[PDB]
């Protein structure tokens, strides 16, 4: 009963011993059916044991595309006409949404706290290195003699291996933007969704850890209470001290901006053998567009970044965080010198254009301004839009000053010699303004709006006539038709 520990009622001991014995008899179909048969029926909330959390972490890591015969040989009938792995992931995500509600109006508080305890104990075992003990006593559990589940060894017993918990993030980020089916499938149904759950649980164990650590404590020691934080040990997996030029290059592994790292790309290998191989008796069915390919890969990269400034906001203004040796500013400028360096503007937009605008606040309208400041260093300054986030008159004065400062207009007479890069530069520098603009409207719910409107109209007319004077057959990257339509 160290912390967040919950003692067992007898009405749940039956279920946890039942499921554990079922898992002992290598019949996991009945294990999953027990959870699926009483999910949305009644207000009982049959929580999964933490050791049965681990096996579902393992059942998810085994999909048909590289082990079809084993999944059929476990159960040749396929009662629900689905694989064990997909049902496992569906069960994890279903209990995942329930966890981040704490909605006690229908469930019971004891059950909800037990569920949180089980998840936290499950995730606390993952201790990253750099290169089984059941706290319960009412029942004897599995995983005490069982190490492997149907070929794949385990997760907490594998990510704890040296030089591996840094490897699998690299694996899932590199293989997300892949054209080959054996490589693409390895991080689309295997390591994208599991990593999403991993990040979300590491973000929730932190949320619980901050409150129920040390109230009324010294700042120089409260900042020290963040070096052993779960998110701190999570980021300790990065085995470098060059985060101003490393963490900006781990998140964007397979992306192609202007990659200047003369160092060799990090070696990327599968965690489990045979992962990057398609099985003969299974043909893929889903046709994933490359746009859809990169649309669900940057929503994960940003969410991994979103868990980085979340500890960084908690670092006090006086001292700096100890264990990772990172600064809340060296990674705003580091996640800017690549973001403004993109080649494919589609990836630029889909990263900056975020589908969860409310939850992904408080750092997107910081990297936006950071990128704009860096890109005005080449377009030709002090940018203070973020400090103005409340009053719109400040935005309008700053933006009219900027457009009058010749930052949104094109460059000097060199037009066709370096058109392809200049146009990309100037259209990239506009998306950040658009995003900050959108954040302005969403965070705010007069004549200065009209002033900026006609100013951007004049600037757009100038760039259009510049494109025409460039004896060009197509239009420039206009900005106004979006602004006028959004404002109304």
């Amino acid at each position: 009963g160290a912390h967040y520990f919950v003692e067992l009622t007898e009405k749940h001991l039956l279920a946890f011993e039942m499921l554990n014995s079922m898992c002992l008899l290598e019949n996991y179909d009945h294990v999953l059916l027990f959870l699926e048969c009483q999910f949305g029926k009644s207000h009982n909330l049959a929580v999964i044991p933490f050791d049965i959390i681990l096996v579902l972490f393992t059942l998810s890591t085994l999909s048909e595309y590289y082990k079809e015969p084993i999944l059929r040989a476990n159960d040749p009938y396929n009662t629900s006409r689905e694989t064990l792995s997909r049902r496992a992931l569906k069960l994890l995500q279903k209990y995942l949404a329930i966890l981040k509600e704490f909605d006690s109006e229908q469930y019971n508080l004891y059950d909800l706290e037990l569920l949180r305890c089980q998840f936290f104990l499950a995730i606390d075992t993952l201790t990253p290195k750099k290169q089984f003990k059941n706290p319960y006593r009412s029942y004897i559990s599995c995983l005490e003699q069982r190490n492997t589940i149907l070929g794949n060894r385990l997760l907490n017993l594998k990510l704890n291996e040296p030089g591996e918990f840094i490897n699998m993030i690299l694996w899932t980020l590199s293989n997300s933007l892949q054209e080959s089916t054996p490589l693409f499938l390895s991080s689309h149904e295997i390591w994208m969704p599991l990593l999403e759950i991993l990040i979300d649980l590491f973000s929730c164990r932190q949320d619980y850890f901050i409150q129920h650590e040390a109230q009324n404590v010294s700042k120089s020691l409260f900042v020290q209470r963040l070096s052993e934080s779960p998110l701190a040990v999570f980021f300790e997996s990065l085995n470098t001290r060059n985060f101003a030029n490393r963490f900006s290059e781990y998140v964007f592994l397979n992306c192609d901006y202007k990659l200047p790292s003369d160092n060799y790309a990090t070696p990327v290998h599968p965690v489990y053998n045979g992962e990057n191989t398609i099985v003969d008796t299974y043909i893929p069915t889903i046709k994933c567009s490359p746009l859809y390919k990169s649309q669900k890969s940057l929503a994960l990269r940003r969410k991994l970044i979103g868990s980085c400034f979340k500890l960084l906001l908690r670092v006090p203004d006086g001292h700096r965080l100890i264990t990772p040796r990172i600064v809340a500013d060296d990674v705003i400028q580091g996640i800017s010198r690549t973001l403004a360096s993109f080649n494919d503007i589609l990836q630029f937009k889909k990263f900056f254009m975020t589908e969860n605008l409310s939850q992904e606040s408080y750092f997107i309208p910081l990297l936006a301004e950071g990128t704009l400041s860096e890109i005005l260093k080449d377009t030709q300054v002090i940018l203070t839009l973020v400090e103005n986030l409340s009053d719109g008159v400040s935005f309008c004065n700053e933006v009219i000053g900027l457009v009058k400062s010749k930052c949104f207009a094109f460059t000097e007479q060199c037009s066709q010699a370096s058109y392809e890069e200049a146009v990309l530069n100037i259209e990239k520098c506009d998306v950040c303004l658009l995003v900050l603009l959108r954040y302005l409207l969403h965070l705010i719910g007069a004549k200065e709006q009209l002033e900026m409107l006609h100013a951007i109209e004049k600037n757009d007319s100038g760039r259009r006539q510049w494109a025409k004077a460039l004896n060009l057959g197509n239009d420039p990257p206009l900005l106004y038709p979006i602004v006028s339509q959004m404002f109304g």
């Binding site: 009945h30 009412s138 004897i140």
Partner: protein, 353 residues
């Protein structure tokens, strides 16, 4: 229903007429065994039926009252509401064997009738048979004990035999298919008396053909059956051995112990991982002694009969090497596990009160 109600003895062993060991302990079990369609050769308490007769009489008979009044009754409209089966043994001539109704009208003097009423026979359910289980055993002994108790070994063994038949059938069809080629080859050899010889080779080829499809048809149905049987044996082995697993953990909690029992299928053991109130790691089966051996023993007992849906259970002389101090605890476990059941009548017999 189907549970034995009353036992009637007439001049058998050391009892003339009644309704320490030797003084009426193994005699009842032998009467149940023989009065249910079994020979005295596989009883080891008298190699012949005529020797089982009380010395001082000529004819011995035992009346066994089955219960035919509930679900699973065998022809309640004909056999009344209580099956009465008796076997009469005398010193000479054929053994006497009858089917009797509730009121008393005789049904059938056929020995197959006894063997079908009961088949409508389990050895473990109904002293030395218990002591063979209820004694010192190894890891790869209790697995066989439980498998035979559930008749699972026999079920699996029959499947293995039929599986070999499928292989044997697969070998034969390969031979038949080769015979097609040779008869077709001989068809090429002879390709007016030679013409008659030429044609007669093809008719053998047709016989080889017709026999071949018969083998494939039979084999395919047999092969399809076995694949179902393998499937129908594994799901009758998962859901059956599992019910034995809970009643080992829900029975191990009465001494404030914890543990389970595995069913490792590649080395064929039934290791008992039991833990005490002051241990941390899953302990072995041989390190424990005394109370942690008898209480594991009797728990391993009670779990075995759970998966099989019967209506009466009997046991004799469970005090083979458990001390009385631990025998009382075992008795408490028995009464708490079995007294609450309203669909299983326990007929355990024990000398001490």
């Amino acid at each position: 229903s189907g549970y034995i109600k009353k036992v009637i003895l007439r001049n058998f062993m050391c009892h003339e007429h009644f309704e320490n060991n030797g003084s009426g302990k193994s005699a009842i079990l032998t009467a149940i065994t023989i009065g249910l369609g079994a020979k005295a050769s596989e009883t080891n308490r008298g190699s012949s039926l005529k020797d089982l007769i009380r010395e001082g009489c000529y004819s011995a008979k035992i009346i066994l009252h089955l219960d035919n009044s509930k679900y699973g009754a065998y022809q309640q409209g004909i056999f009344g509401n209580e099956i009465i089966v008796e076997r009469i043994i005398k010193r000479d001539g054929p053994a006497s064997f009858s089917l009797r109704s509730e009121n008393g009208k005789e049904i059938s003097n056929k020995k197959k009738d006894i063997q079908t009423v009961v088949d409508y026979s389990n050895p473990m359910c109904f002293q030395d048979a218990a002591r063979s289980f209820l004694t010192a055993s190894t890891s790869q002994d209790k697995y066989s004990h439980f498998m035979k108790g559930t008749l699972l070994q026999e079920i699996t063994e029959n499947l293995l035999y039929a599986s070999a038949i499928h292989d044997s059938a697969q070998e034969n069809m390969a031979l038949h298919l080769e015979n097609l080629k040779s008869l077709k080859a001989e068809y090429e050899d002879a390709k007016e008396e030679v013409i008659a010889l030429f044609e007669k080779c093809r008719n053998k080829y047709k016989e080889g053909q017709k026999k071949y499809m018969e083998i494939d048809e039979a084999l395919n149905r047999l092969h399809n059956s076995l694949k179902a049987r393998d499937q129908n044996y594994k799901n009758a082995e998962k859901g059956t051995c599992f019910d034995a697993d809970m009643d080992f953990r829900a029975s191990l909690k009465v001494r404030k112990f914890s543990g389970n029992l595995s069913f490792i299928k590649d080395t064929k053991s039934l290791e008992i991982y039991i833990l005490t109130t002051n241990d941390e790691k899953a302990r072995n089966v041989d390190t424990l002694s005394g109370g942690e051996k008898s209480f594991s023993q009797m728990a391993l007992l009670l779990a075995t009969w759970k998966p099989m849906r019967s209506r009466i259970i009997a046991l004799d002389q469970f005090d083979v090497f458990m001390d009385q101090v631990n025998r009382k605890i075992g008795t408490t476990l028995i009464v708490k596990k079995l007294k609450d059941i309203a669909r299983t009548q326990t007929i355990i017999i024990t000398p001490q009160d």
